[PDB]
Amino acid sequence: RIRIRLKAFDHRLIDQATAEIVETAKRTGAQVRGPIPLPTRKERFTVLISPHVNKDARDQYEIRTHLRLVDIVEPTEKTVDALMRLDLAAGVDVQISLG
């Protein structure tokens, strides 16, 4: 089988990017295994704000890396080819992985 990761920062931009892959596999063939919601790393950061001397005043930011994963079971030639035909919008990373 062939598995693809999807990493993004925004879950109104990961879901179109994964529906345009399920509606590519299910338009070149069949046997996709849906999106499976993996864990979500939240890389926090905490900085001071004041330029000289205030240790009791802070801003706290986070970054929430959204994961998804999609399997592909029985690949034809056009099934693997119409996927590498496809690019995606910026913000989303992929990494194709046979097994």
Partner: protein
């Protein structure tokens, strides 16, 4: 044929299964005394089986994961008090009168900025 519950205390998730039987208590393939240390934990794990008169009639299978020694006791208490509401359902008014159906919405409260604990200040001079 068996009935099912699911309860959550502080940071635990019990999972309880009820069958009619004699009274066997199994937790993560351990007997009830082998797991728990204190007799108040053996009290609170048993409490709603004592409250209604259903110690003898039923056996139960329990799995619990994650939490503390009180978390995996209150969790099973909430689990059985859910799982007995899928047995006869006129137990519900007396379990509610006893105060066992309410899931405790308490949890550990975070640490803020410039507070050496969740609410403890540092000290003070003039």
């Amino acid at each position: 044929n068996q009935y099912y519950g699911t309860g959550r205390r502080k940071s635990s998730a019990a999972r309880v299964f009820i069958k009619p039987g004699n009274g066997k208590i199994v937790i993560n393939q351990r007997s009830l005394e082998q797991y728990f240390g204190r007799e108040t934990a053996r009290m609170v794990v048993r409490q709603p089986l004592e409250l209604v008169d259903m110690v003898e009639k039923l056996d139960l299978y329990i799995t619990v994961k994650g939490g503390g020694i009180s978390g995996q006791a209150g969790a099973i208490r909430h689990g059985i008090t859910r799982a007995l509401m899928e047995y006869d359902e006129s137990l519900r008014s007396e379990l509610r009168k006893a105060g066992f159906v309410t899931r405790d919405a308490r949890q550990v409260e975070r640490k803020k900025v410039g507070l050496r604990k969740a609410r403890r200040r540092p000290q003070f001079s003039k």
